[PDB]
Design an enzyme around this catalytic site. Structure first.
Site, PDB file in Angstrom:
ATOM      1  N   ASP A   1      32.867  45.302  40.588  1.00  0.00           N
ATOM      2  CA  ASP A   1      33.208  45.101  41.990  1.00  0.00           C
ATOM      3  C   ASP A   1      34.679  45.519  42.236  1.00  0.00           C
ATOM      4  OD1 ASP A   1      33.818  44.246  44.582  1.00  0.00           O
ATOM      5  OD2 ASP A   1      32.872  42.238  44.326  1.00  0.00           O
TER       6      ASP A   1
ATOM      7  N   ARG B   1      36.757  43.657  44.999  1.00  0.00           N
ATOM      8  CA  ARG B   1      37.246  42.394  44.448  1.00  0.00           C
ATOM      9  C   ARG B   1      38.431  42.648  43.515  1.00  0.00           C
ATOM     10  NH1 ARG B   1      36.807  38.564  39.884  1.00  0.00           N
ATOM     11  NH2 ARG B   1      36.772  40.586  38.777  1.00  0.00           N
TER      12      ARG B   1
ATOM     13  N   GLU C   1      40.173  28.899  30.498  1.00  0.00           N
ATOM     14  CA  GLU C   1      38.779  29.272  30.667  1.00  0.00           C
ATOM     15  C   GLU C   1      37.907  28.244  29.967  1.00  0.00           C
ATOM     16  OE1 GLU C   1      36.851  31.555  32.531  1.00  0.00           O
ATOM     17  OE2 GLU C   1      35.434  30.141  31.581  1.00  0.00           O
TER      18      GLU C   1
ATOM     19  N   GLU D   1      41.111  21.053  34.227  1.00  0.00           N
ATOM     20  CA  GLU D   1      41.401  19.665  34.601  1.00  0.00           C
ATOM     21  C   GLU D   1      41.981  18.866  33.426  1.00  0.00           C
ATOM     22  OE1 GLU D   1      38.549  21.320  35.370  1.00  0.00           O
ATOM     23  OE2 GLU D   1      37.964  20.846  37.430  1.00  0.00           O
TER      24      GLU D   1
ATOM     25  N   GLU E   1      40.329  33.621  40.773  1.00  0.00           N
ATOM     26  CA  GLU E   1      39.196  34.098  41.534  1.00  0.00           C
ATOM     27  C   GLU E   1      38.068  33.055  41.462  1.00  0.00           C
ATOM     28  OE1 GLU E   1      35.681  36.358  41.183  1.00  0.00           O
ATOM     29  OE2 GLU E   1      36.043  34.867  42.769  1.00  0.00           O
TER      30      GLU E   1
ATOM     31  N   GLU F   1      29.130  27.006  43.734  1.00  0.00           N
ATOM     32  CA  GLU F   1      29.841  26.681  42.471  1.00  0.00           C
ATOM     33  C   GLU F   1      30.849  25.498  42.533  1.00  0.00           C
ATOM     34  OE1 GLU F   1      30.166  31.387  41.744  1.00  0.00           O
ATOM     35  OE2 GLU F   1      31.090  30.222  40.094  1.00  0.00           O
TER      36      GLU F   1
ATOM     37  N   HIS G   1      30.290  42.193  45.449  1.00  0.00           N
ATOM     38  CA  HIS G   1      29.185  41.485  44.761  1.00  0.00           C
ATOM     39  C   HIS G   1      28.732  40.183  45.444  1.00  0.00           C
ATOM     40  CE1 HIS G   1      32.065  38.721  42.940  1.00  0.00           C
ATOM     41  NE2 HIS G   1      31.050  38.030  42.454  1.00  0.00           N
TER      42      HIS G   1
END
Ligand SMILES: Nc1ncnc2c1ncn2[C@@H]1O[C@H](CSCC[C@H](N)C(=O)O)[C@@H](O)[C@H]1O
Ligand SMILES: Nc1ncnc2c1ncn2[C@@H]1O[C@H](CSCC[C@H](N)C(=O)O)[C@@H](O)[C@H]1O
Ligand SMILES: CN(CCN)Cc1cn[nH]c1-c1ccc(F)cc1
Ligand SMILES: CN(CCN)Cc1cn[nH]c1-c1ccc(F)cc1
Lengths: 352, 337
Positions: A40, A43, A89, A118, A132, A141, A294
């Site tokens: 994409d 994006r 991640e 967190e 993103e 989500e 996308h």
């Protein structure tokens, strides 16, 4: 002991959520989803340029990338001149991100950190956050909470946020693919000599009568009135984390351009990168009027088609929220009124 | 349990989407159309059983061909739509729609002919052939007509150019974005090639690396055919490659044959990549990673198509193969969700 009992009371819901989160992060452990995101170009270039455009504020500074994925955006930050990037991640994909970082000779500038933002432990507060986080209909989500949690806990006072805001839009639409599929049963007589036009009703109930949000890309000419903004999210706005749980949305009203079969509404979004005193603010748009992405658009079908005319009035209310069962599944409550028809309700949930 | 396997299966056929797809499949529907019409001499004034009539289209082809009575048997809720279509075409005393599974339906009579479009992905996915054979044994008269009459399975080694482009994507990231992600090729391979799922994807003839090998012939009139399905259909194959390529695995596909009638030319419905595309596409069996082949690289092995233990309707493929002088390898697949 009273303290202990109180912990024992929350143990069950805390575990269910950990298990839920773990299923969600797994959605990102496979190559295809990243392939899609990096293919994409709209994006990915908007982020790159959005980052680049702020190189002056990022030179020698520190960045947190919330949901680094394969590491691409973190590397954009490094290339822009950031001293240190923490690439956080939660999905197994962090391993590929670590590989990309080492392979690009950047292991001293980008630190890949596994697990949820967190509960991640950074060595310091950061000067900027990049992420993103947007899903279908923006909020599918429910990753925004994660970004906001990271901001409150880790961003330095007056720090930079990329992107900084988001806007939601709605318009009545006409789906040409849908129209072709509904009309298909009337074409059967001419292809094969068997009249199946009586199945149009049945086709309509199956394809429009369901309550799922459908991801489909439309173009400009499918839009039947001026798109209406219905929400604005300023990411730095105090306690916006609460607004999210309660629902984001608003009322809308608009007037149709002309004769068209109306199938429902499309919703879409845009995010804005603050600019340095260079070039100004860069908008990443998912509008059907703009180059495809996308995310496409999120389509909300009426139960059956409705013919509209020039100056047909369309109004209503839309609210985006978490589903009862799956907090990470987008729910849309739609109140709508077309022409002289009575006001109607439909309650959609994101397509699996 | 077993009750819930069937709910989910028939629910899919209760919905419009699969029927639009089958009917918009021109190669499929026109093969049945022409196949049925050219057997007019066998069908005029005769009685027909349509196993799994769906929206009822093939039953109506049969009636248009002269059948005096067609029993359109359908186990999903779509039987209501079929009955409506039949009424709407003024055909309610030629075509009678009967709800429920063909295994337990009661017809008022044995029949002259069976018609059925029962083929799934990789031919045997959905395991519907049992039902047709069950209906043949129970309801078809001695010497009765079967449409189509037989099925064949084919296998060929392939280089899938679309997959190749997906693996090579990561090497192109630098060119446009200034980040080298070519190190993700390995990971892409493990994701797209290393799983154990049968992939339904359409290939070009240009993707085929050797002469296609027939590995099963199913003659539907044969008693005993029923019992073989449980043992598995398949056997050995061997072929030799056309040229240099990264071999990704194998594709299988099938054809079915309608006997010629009076006019006496058989109609073949093919799902080969050398023929116009159908909704069945081809079924892809990817190796764990590519292997380089040359002209005259010999490829051999054995393939078995069988139903999964845990879900009888889910196709399972057991593959054994040998590329060139490389050692023999082994891989087991189950149909994609
Ligand atoms: N609470 C959380 N903590 C850390 N990572 C998260 C998270 N919630 C979602 N993510 C991750 O955020 C990513 C969002 S999409 C991938 C974005 C990537 N930076 C890119 O631009 O290509 C996913 O990889 C997902 O696993
Ligand atoms: N044991 C069984 N008894 C009756 N119908 C069955 C069956 N197994 C599958 N079916 C039905 O058979 C159909 C197969 S596909 C639909 C074919 C339809 N005749 C057409 O060509 O368009 C489905 O509608 C499915 O619900
Ligand atoms: C929506 N984008 C962007 C996420 N920041 C991720 C994506 C790309 N393809 N598919 C997805 C996707 C879709 C649904 C999910 F729950 C998770 C990921
Ligand atoms: C495979 N064909 C033909 C079956 N006779 C039906 C179809 C069309 N689109 N999708 C399907 C399908 C695919 C998988 C199933 F388990 C059932 C139906």
């Amino acid at each position: 002991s009273i303290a202990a009992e109180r912990e024992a009371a929350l143990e069950r819901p805390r575990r269910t959520k950990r298990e839920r989160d773990q299923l969600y992060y797994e959605c990102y452990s496979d190559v295809s989803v990243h392939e899609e995101m990096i293919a994409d170009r709209v994006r990915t270039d908007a982020y790159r340029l959005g980052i680049l455009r702020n190189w002056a504020a990022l030179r020698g500074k520190t960045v947190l990338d919330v949901g680094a994925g394969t590491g691409i955006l973190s590397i954009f930050c490094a290339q822009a001149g950031a001293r240190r990037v923490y690439a956080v991640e939660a999905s197994a994909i962090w391993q590929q991100a670590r590989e990309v970082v080492r392979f690009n000779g950047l292991e001293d500038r980008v630190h890949v950190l596994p697990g949820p933002v967190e509960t991640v432990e950074l060595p310091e507060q950061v000067d900027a956050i990049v992420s993103e986080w947007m899903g279908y209909g923006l909020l599918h989500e429910s990753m925004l909470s994660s970004v906001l949690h990271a901001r409150t806990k880790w961003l330095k006072e007056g720090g930079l946020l990329l992107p900084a805001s988001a806007e939601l839009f709605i318009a009545p639409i006409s789906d040409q693919m849908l129209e072709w599929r509904l009309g298909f049963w009337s074409q059967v007589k001419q292809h094969y000599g068997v009249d199946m036009s009586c199945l149009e009703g049945f086709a309509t109930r199956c394809l429009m009568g369901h309550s799922e949000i459908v991801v489909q890309g439309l173009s400009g000419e499918d839009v039947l009135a001026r798109p209406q903004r219905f929400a604005q999210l300023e990411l730095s706005r105090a306690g916006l984390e609460q607004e999210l749980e309660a629902g984001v949305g608003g009322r809308f009203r608009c007037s149709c351009y002309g004769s068209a079969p109306m199938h429902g509404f499309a919703i879409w979004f845009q995010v804005t990168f603050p600019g340095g005193e260079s070039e100004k603010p860069l908008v990443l748009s998912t509008s059907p009027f703009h180059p495809a992405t996308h995310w496409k658009q999120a389509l909300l079908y009426l139960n059956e088609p409705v013919q509209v005319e020039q100056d047909t009035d369309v109004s209503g209310e839309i609210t985006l929220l978490p589903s009862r069962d799956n907090p990470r599944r987008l729910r849309v409550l739609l109140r709508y009124k077309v022409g002289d028809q009575e006001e109607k309700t439909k309650d959609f949930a994101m397509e699996d």
